[PDB]
UniProtKB/TrEMBL annotation, chain A:
The keyword Ion transport does not apply. It is found in: Membrane. This is Ribonuclease K. It holds the Pfam family V-ATPase_su_f. The gene is Rnasek. It comes from Rattus norvegicus (Rat).
Automatic annotation (TrEMBL), chain B:
Subunit of the V0 complex of vacuolar(H+)-ATPase (V-ATPase), a multisubunit enzyme composed of a peripheral complex (V1) that hydrolyzes ATP and a membrane integral complex (V0) that translocates protons. V-ATPase is responsible for acidifying and maintaining the pH of intracellular compartments and in some cell types, is targeted to the plasma membrane, where it is responsible for acidifying the extracellular environment. The keyword Ion transport applies. This is V-type proton ATPase subunit. The lineage of its organism: Eukaryota, Metazoa, Chordata, Craniata, Vertebrata. Belongs to the V-ATPase V0D/AC39 subunit family. It comes from Rattus norvegicus (Rat). It comes from the Eukaryota. V-ATPase is a heteromultimeric enzyme made up of two complexes: the ATP-hydrolytic V1 complex and the proton translocation V0 complex. The V1 complex consists of three catalytic AB heterodimers that form a heterohexamer, three peripheral stalks each consisting of EG heterodimers, one central rotor including subunits D and F, and the regulatory subunits C and H. The proton translocation complex V0 consists of the proton transport subunit a, a ring of proteolipid subunits c9c'', rotary subunit d, subunits e and f, and the accessory subunits ATP6AP1/Ac45 and ATP6AP2/PRR.
Automatic annotation (TrEMBL), chain C:
This is V-type proton ATPase 21 kDa proteolipid subunit c''. The keyword Transmembrane applies. GO terms for cellular component: clathrin-coated vesicle membrane; proton-transporting V-type ATPase, V0 domain. Residues 51-110, 137-195 form the V-ATPase proteolipid subunit C-like domain.
Length: 84, 350, 203, 40, 43, 441, 150, 150, 150, 150, 150, 51, 47
């Protein structure tokens, strides 16, 4: 599909933004396993520091999945703008 | 009241600034003097180009004539009017429509008569005053049928309400054309005045004085000019507008009057007019009554710009420039005809 | 005039009903059933305070805002033939914001006095809190309305200034004196609002 | 009684904001468009 | 008991609804047919 | 040495300002307000930095600051392709012409965002957060507080004997996740905006002295600059000193009924000096408060009426509409004195817009991307994909474009009205030399 | 003791005085400024004489300030209500009376400027009329000052 | 022995009397000044005579001051209520009646001043009608004075 | 056993009787004066015999004065309420009835004087018509006098 | 211990902040679109520039969104009333402020679009005047934010 | 234990959201359709593009349908009142905001569609502005969704 | 509501019919719709008043 | 346990549903019919 090279280029930029930002998010949690403290915690939070390490690892996993989707999107958009 | 000075500039703020900015460009007494000190039409152009006027004779015939200066000046103010008329909203546009109506009235008088004496619309339209326009059809391609023009007017032409006095076509054929146009003008002035009084704020107080003057002006001048013609005194009275100072009492005396002195005797009861008849020396080499009326009318149109929150500034705007056009052409005519001693017959516009 | 007719009909019916109800309570010799003290005491001072604060800020910007477009339209229109106008006549708008600023400062200073009561039964509770509540309400209203009308004045005057300057550049400076009075009127409201809340306490 | 503290206070705030709504709507309704365009 | 509640509700509910009808009736009453096309000739 | 216009060839010349590929854009936004007086101090050399700085304060967002630069870089990278092409799109041309302005604006926005430690509402952890020692919190008679914590927050006390120490650089990241950031950080930015605004005004006034020297108008400083700067210093500089004093003089030990600089400032102007009931910042403050306000009044006669008074004195001795000159000077005095008060409020835009932006960033993050996260692995990852894509879209649509444009305009407003009006006065004519402009034709 | 809410009316008085006087001054000022600007385009030589109406408006604004300040300084918590009612009356008396005066100031100044624009000899007469409006503002102030001291 | 808030009615009387009278005089003054400014341009020599309607208006303002002060002096805390109703009636009676009179003063002066310029013989008729307006204002004053002492 | 507020109803009657009557007479006076001024331009000899509508307007004002004074003198503290309602009815009856007449007086006077200018024969007719308005005003007085003594 | 209805005032704040801001921005948008459509016919090259008033109005709409969301995320059941009135004030404060802002935006933009097309030198002034209105709207936002911590 | 009649507010929300949104879309639809009928007679080739205002108006109506249904499906008998206050806020927030957007749609549609026939380059400009009105409507939906589940 | 419809349609329809005799049938049909709108009211009233 | 007056609201609903929709349909019918009459005189073929 062509879709227009102007829109393929926009997708490439968004895809690069997605991969860069999402991987960074996972790293920050992986290193500080943190101020943000937004891993989607449970309300019934117990006295278990290991729960913060575990959820932070979950955030990294989920973030890298999102980046993987941006890698696929960027790849497709790359070929569109190059061929257009 | 507290009615004006509040919502006025919400929609009409731009036009008020623009129209006064345009007024700022009208020829001053100093500028008229520079136009007088020419004695040549080419120099007249060059001196006029010193103001907002000018650059309108460019690309025209190398010889400069009065007909070109006249037409071009009219065109300038028509364009400026249409601009402001188009960039306007019903609250103000309806007021402006009345101004255009005065010209439409004259134009429809032209459409009839010619229709009555087999003339085609296409031949008549080129001689109609601008702003009449008549973009509507049915008034166009009437097939030189008076009935078709009469019906098209009743239906499409905004002046249909005014023609309620002159109806059934029978009136068109049996009435003198000038009685028809004076009758229609009365209907216009009466409706327009009432409209101004419905806008019962600053506009009513700023606008009506001018309309009331015009109404009384018509009574005075019509009475005098009617002396030498064939017209029943009652039919003459029928043409006197009721929006003025003569209506309560005074028109009855003008209707009976058969002499200039009797008309002046009426003015004697109205100092604002008495002074005009006294100023109108009417000597063989002096100003006349019509000239004093123009001077008074302009004074009023200038005073109109003492109110910053009304519609009357636009009415005065058009009328003031119309006189300015008369003034400029007068100078061109004085040059063209070489009568320098008659140059000072323009009406100063301050 | 469809809207004006609606507004009038509501206005007349609103007060006409109040007259009938008021006089009826008197006629039927009710035991002061409509008790103003009751309304004033049950009505939480918190509403009165927060209302006055919102009024102080909200009314003041309305004034400024009103005047701004009054003078904006005149400047923009006239400026077509006199573009010089924007150089000097923008000060009219500065005066309009300045009227908003007067109210804005007071709105913040007043709101800085807002405190909780931890109060329940008004009986012998919050005697001072009612005074401070009503005072804050008044002071907010005082400055709000005063700035509201000032902003309208300044707009009207600034419009004339723009129209005048377009035709005579020498008139600008002299006219400025009128707008200064307009600003002073708003400052007078500020002085009173300051006094009204000069000795208040919340909580 | 006819009114409670709650009801009355609610009505007071309701009317204030109703007046604001009315003011805004008033000027919004009294808004016109152009009859014609100036030129081509 | 709870008079103030039914009272408050019914008064303001019926008042707002009644006005909506009154305004709607006004707007319908004064419908502008255009006063043109054939009206000028019948007038 | 200040930059001034070039000489042109006893009539008022046009103003000629030499510009280059980078500084031309800055001169234009100056010229947009007006053409400066011949031999006037050119504000543009100071705008080059001052304006980006004011933006960076208004747009203090580390993450968007980067994106903003990248946008400018894109345009610069195509500089050769954009110049040697047709550009009928004027909005593209304008932002292109301002591409070097935008880049700089981003550069400072990063600087200020870094100190604020906000990158899309993200803090910058330098391992220096030592504000409090949580281990000691529990020791201070807080045993199993996390059980009750399920329904409470609990604010960390000051000066418990175990807390203290500043964050190495910028605001301690811990405030980025606090529920009361809205008082700690909002207050700081409030005070910062006031301090910066006053300094900027004083700078603009100081420049007026150089202009007064260049045109050899000793009177413009004898009754102008001097009494004007005295007015401003005594009232506005004093306030700034008090703000720093408060920060350095009082600790939490006096947090209850701690002196309020707002109330003391108001009481200063009103000469209200209660004997007791309110703690003063320092002993004798009442005497200083009275002194400064009286002096501020004493300088006014010079600025208010003595200029036309001495001009009348000197005029009649050498031999001037005295009444008209009094009108001019009186209006000028009011504008300066009242404007300083109003201008100070103008610079509250730095706080207002910095806060407004911070509110957009915090809310846009919290109500868009945060909700996209979930404890379920695959659903969370895929959700973040779609939610983030929309999030990035909103960040651009709302903050990078619209708010960046707003902050541009508001900082430009401050330059034109509050800064320039202290020294950059009068008008000049457009400098239009013969040039070979018709190169393409 | 001193009942609650008693200060309410005195606060409304102090507020009313200032607001209504501001209304009066604002109307008279805006109307006068309009007329002055319109004249000065036609002839600037009358501008200085035409300024007084604007000050006249400001006087109404001060009138209101004098009472509003007098009350605002008098306002306390322990008000015996009687004093609050006196304050309410004084506030309304000066404010609403100044409003009427300011209206007259506006109308007369605006018409006066147009009158002088055509004939400068009207100046003295127009000022004398505005003097009556100032007297109307004074009467309001007088009554308000009397009431506040009862 | 007396009820609370009984003084409320009295202070409303003193205020109302002054406010309505100022509104009446202000209206008549505003209309008169407009007519004077418009007329005097054509007939400047009449400027010193056309002021009279404005004085007539000032009389309405005095009417109000007299009663408002008379009531104010009679305002106490221990008011018997009965007396307060009389004071309120007196205040409204003179104020509202003066308001009506001021309206007529305005309209009659406006028309009369211009009519006089166009008709010098109208001067006497104009004054006579203005005398009737003053009589209408007095009737209110008479009743108010009767009530305030009843 | 006398109901409180009984005096309120009463005093409101006396005031209303005066206020509404002045409103009517003032309206009729304002309209009559306007027509008279315009008429005087053409027919100055009629100015003096054109004042009658204004004198008649004053009759309406007196109608009101008489009742208001009769009530005011009748007002006491220990009023049995019954009398208070009669006083309110009497006040409204004469005041509002005279008010309506005042408009008739004004409108007919204006039209009559303007017409008389052209048709001097209209004068007897103008007066007869205005006589009917005077009769309408008296009817209100008659009922008010009956009620105030009942 | 929580006064009932305490949550009612709070919820209204969030709603008003959004509704009134939308009204203002919509008004400004409607006014601008009218001027833009009329102007753009003759000078289509100015279509892009003419959008600015609309973007500014859109900012007003955001201003409102920020408060409405901030309040909404701050609502609970056990609201202590004190907090509720702060939220209501915040909503109303930004609402009316944004509403007035939007009106100034719309009115000025309409004139500005026409003025700029006729005189491009007015472009900067158009932005400036709209800029001041946007600054006024910001104040409305900030005060709504300030109350959230009081 | 739950307050009675608590469902009233939530029910009014569901209905209010739908009605106000229909009012908004109806205005924009009627105003745009008028411009379409007036325009497309001259430029029939634009008949399939001038519908856009109307389509975008339908969006306002859907925004209301989504919330009105969301609210209705959220109502029960034993409502804790708190939830009902939220439901009314959400209903009004989207409804009245959609109403404001509907006005923008209508006015911009009319001006844009007729302008487009005069200048086809306006077509994109019209959409962009209408896009801003749609964004204004969206903000209302966002807040309503936030409140309705809060 | 039906009365409004009848009146407005009757006025325009009857006058139009003289100008266009072919309008008669269309006028009747439209008036029939207004009568149906009036009947809907009757139908609801009959069902409701008997419930 | 049933609140008295409770049925009042439901009855007003049944009425409002018909009254308001009737007002709308009546407006639309009358407004369209007027335009139709104007059309038919110009050309009945579209009636």
């Amino acid at each position: 599909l062509c879709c227009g090279p102007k829109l393929a280029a926009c997708g490439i930029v968004l895809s690069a933004w997605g991969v860069i930002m999402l991987i960074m998010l996972g790293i920050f949690f992986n290193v500080h396993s943190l101020i943000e403290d937004v891993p989607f915690t449970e309300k019934d939070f117990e006295n278990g520091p290991q729960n913060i390490y575990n959820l932070y690892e979950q955030v990294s996993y989920n973030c890298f999945i999102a980046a993987g989707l941006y890698l696929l999107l960027g790849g497709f958009s790359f070929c569109q703008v190059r061929l257009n | 009241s507290f009615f004006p000075e509040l919502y006025f500039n919400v929609d009409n703020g731009y036009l008020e600034g623009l129209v006064r900015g345009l007024k700022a460009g009208v020829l001053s007494q100093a500028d008229y003097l520079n136009l007088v000190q020419c004695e040549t039409l080419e120099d007249l152009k060059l001196h006029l180009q010193s103001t907002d006027y000018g650059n309108f004779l460019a690309n025209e015939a190398s010889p400069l004539t009065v007909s070109v200066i006249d037409d071009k000046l009219k065109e300038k103010m028509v364009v400026e009017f249409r601009h402001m008329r188009n960039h306007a909203y019903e609250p103000l546009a309806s007021f402006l429509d009345f101004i255009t109506y005065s010209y439409m009235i004259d134009n429809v008088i032209l459409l009839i008569t010619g229709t009555l004496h087999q003339r085609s619309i296409a031949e008549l339209v080129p001689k109609c005053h601008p702003l009449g326009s008549f973009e509507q059809m049915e008034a166009v391609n009437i097939a030189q049928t008076p009935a078709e023009l009469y019906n098209a007017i009743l239906v499409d032409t905004p002046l249909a309400a005014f023609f309620q006095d002159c109806i059934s076509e029978q009136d068109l054929d049996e009435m003198n054309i000038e009685i028809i146009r004076n009758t229609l003008y009365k209907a216009y002035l009466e409706s327009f005045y009432k409209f101004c009084t419905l806008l019962g704020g600053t506009t009513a107080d700023a606008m009506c004085p001018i309309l009331e003057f015009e109404a009384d002006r018509r009574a005075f001048i019509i009475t005098i000019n009617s002396f030498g013609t064939e017209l029943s005194k009652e039919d003459r009275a029928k043409l006197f507008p009721h929006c003025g100072r003569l209506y309560p009492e005074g028109l009855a005396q003008l209707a009976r009057a058969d002499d200039y002195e009797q008309v002046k005797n009426v003015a004697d009861y109205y100092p604002e007019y008495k002074l005009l008849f006294e100023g109108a020396g009417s000597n063989p080499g002096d100003k006349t009554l019509e000239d004093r009326f123009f001077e008074h009318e302009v004074k009023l149109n200038k005073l109109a710009f003492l109110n910053q929150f009304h519609f009357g500034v636009f009415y005065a705007f058009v009328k003031l420039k119309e006189q300015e056009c008369r003034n400029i052409v007068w100078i061109a005519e004085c040059i063209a005809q070489r009568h320098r001693a008659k140059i000072d017959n323009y009406i100063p516009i301050f | 005039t469809g809207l004006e007719l609606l507004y009038l009909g509501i206005f007349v019916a609103f007060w006409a009903c109040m007259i009938v109800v008021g006089i009826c309570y008197t006629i039927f010799d009710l035991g002061f059933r409509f008790d103003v003290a009751w309304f004033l005491t049950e009505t939480s001072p918190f509403m009165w305070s927060n209302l006055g604060i919102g009024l102080a800020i909200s009314l003041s910007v309305v004034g400024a805002a009103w005047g701004i477009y009054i003078t904006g339209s005149s400047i923009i229109g006239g400026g077509v033939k006199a573009p010089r106008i924007k150089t000097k006549n923008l000060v009219s708008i500065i005066f309009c914001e300045a009227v908003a600023i007067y109210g804005i400062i007071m709105a913040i200073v007043i709101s800085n006095m807002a405190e909780p009561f931890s109060a329940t039964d008004p009986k012998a509770i919050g005697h001072r809190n009612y005074h401070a509540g009503y005072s804050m309400f008044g002071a907010g209203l005082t400055v709000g309305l005063s700035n509201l009308f000032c902003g309208v004045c300044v707009g009207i005057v600034g419009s004339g200034a723009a129209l005048a300057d377009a035709q005579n550049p020498s008139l600008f400076v002299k006219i400025l004196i009128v707008e200064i009075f307009g600003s002073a009127i708003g400052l007078f409201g500020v002085i009173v609002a300051i006094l009204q809340t000069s000795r208040v306490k919340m909580g | 009684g006819f009114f409670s503290p709650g009801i009355w206070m609610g009505l007071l705030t309701t009317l204030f904001m109703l007046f604001i709504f009315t003011y805004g709507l008033h000027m919004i309704l009294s808004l016109k468009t152009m009859d014609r365009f100036d030129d081509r | 008991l709870e008079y103030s509640v039914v009272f408050n509700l019914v008064l303001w509910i019926m008042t707002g609804l009644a006005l909506a009808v009154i305004i709607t009736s006004y707007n319908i009453w004064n419908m502008d047919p255009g006063y043109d096309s054939i009206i000028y000739r019948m007038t | 040495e200040l930059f001034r216009s070039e000489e042109m060839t006893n009539q008022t010349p046009p103003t000629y300002n030499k510009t280059n590929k980078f500084t031309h854009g800055f001169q234009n936004i100056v010229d947009a307000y007006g053409i400066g007086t011949y031999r006037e101090i050119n504000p543009a050399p100071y705008t080059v930095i001052t304006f980006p700085f004011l933006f960076a304060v208004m747009f203090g967002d580390f993450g968007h600051g980067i994106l903003m630069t990248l946008f400018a870089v894109w345009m610069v990278l195509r500089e050769s392709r954009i110049l040697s092409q047709k550009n009928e799109n004027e909005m593209f041309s304008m932002v292109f012409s301002g591409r070097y302005i935008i880049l700089l604006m981003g550069l400072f926005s990063i600087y200020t965002g870094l100190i604020y430690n906000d990158c899309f509402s993200k803090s910058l952890n330098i391992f220096g957060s030592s504000w409090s020692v949580r281990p000691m919190f529990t020791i201070g008679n807080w045993t199993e507080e996390t059980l009750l914590g399920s329904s409470v927050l609990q604010l960390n006390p000051a000066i418990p004997g175990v807390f203290g120490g500043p964050y190495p650089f910028g605001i301690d990241p811990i405030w980025n996740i606090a529920t009361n950031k809205l008082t700690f950080l909002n207050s700081f930015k409030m005070k910062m905006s006031v301090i910066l605004g006053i300094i900027h005004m004083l700078f603009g006034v100081s420049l007026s002295l150089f202009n007064h020297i260049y045109f050899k108008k000793p009177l413009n400083i004898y009754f102008g600059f001097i009494p004007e700067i005295i007015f401003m210093s005594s009232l506005f500089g004093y306030l700034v000193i008090l703000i720093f004093y408060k920060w350095t003089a009082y600790d939490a030990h006096s947090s209850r009924n701690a002196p309020s600089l707002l109330i003391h400032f108001i009481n200063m102007f009103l000469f209200s000096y209660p004997e007791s009931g309110n703690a003063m910042l320092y002993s004798g403050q009442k005497g200083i408060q009275c002194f400064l306000i009286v002096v501020a009044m004493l300088c006014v006669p010079w600025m208010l009426l003595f200029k036309p008074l001495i001009l009348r004195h000197q005029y009649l001795r050498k031999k001037f509409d005295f009444g008209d000159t009094m009108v001019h000077q009186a209006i000028h005095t009011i504008e300066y004195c009242l404007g300083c008060i109003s201008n100070t409020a103008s610079y509250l835009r730095l706080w207002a817009l910095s806060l407004a932006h911070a509110q957009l960033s915090e809310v846009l993050w919290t109500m868009v991307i945060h909700i996209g996260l979930h404890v379920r692995s695959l659903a969370g990852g895929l959700g973040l994909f779609f939610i983030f894509a929309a999030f990035a879209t909103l960040t651009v649509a709302i903050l990078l474009i619209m708010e960046g444009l707003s902050a541009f305009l508001h900082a430009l407003r401050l330059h034109w009205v509050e800064f320039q009006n202290k020294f950059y006065t009068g008008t000049g004519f457009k400098f239009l030399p013969f040039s070979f402009e018709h190169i393409r034709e | 003791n001193n009942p609650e809410y008693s200060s309410f009316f005195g606060v409304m008085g102090a507020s009313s005085a200032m607001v209504f006087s501001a209304m009066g001054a604002a109307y008279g000022t805006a109307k006068s400024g309009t007329g002055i600007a319109a004249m000065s385009v036609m002839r600037p030589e009358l501008i200085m004489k035409s300024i007084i109406p604007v000050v006249m408006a400001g006087i109404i604004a001060i009138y209101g300030l004098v009472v509003a300040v007098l009350i605002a300084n008098s306002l306390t918590d322990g008000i015996t209500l009687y004093r609050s009612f006196l304050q309410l009356g004084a506030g309304l008396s000066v404010g609403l009376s100044g409003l009427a005066a300011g209206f007259a100031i506006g109308i007369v100044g605006d018409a006066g400027v147009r009158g002088t624009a055509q004939q400068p000899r009207l100046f003295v007469g127009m000022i004398l009329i505005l003097i009556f409006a100032e007297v109307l503002g004074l009467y309001g102030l007088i009554v308000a000052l009397i009431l506040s001291t009862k």
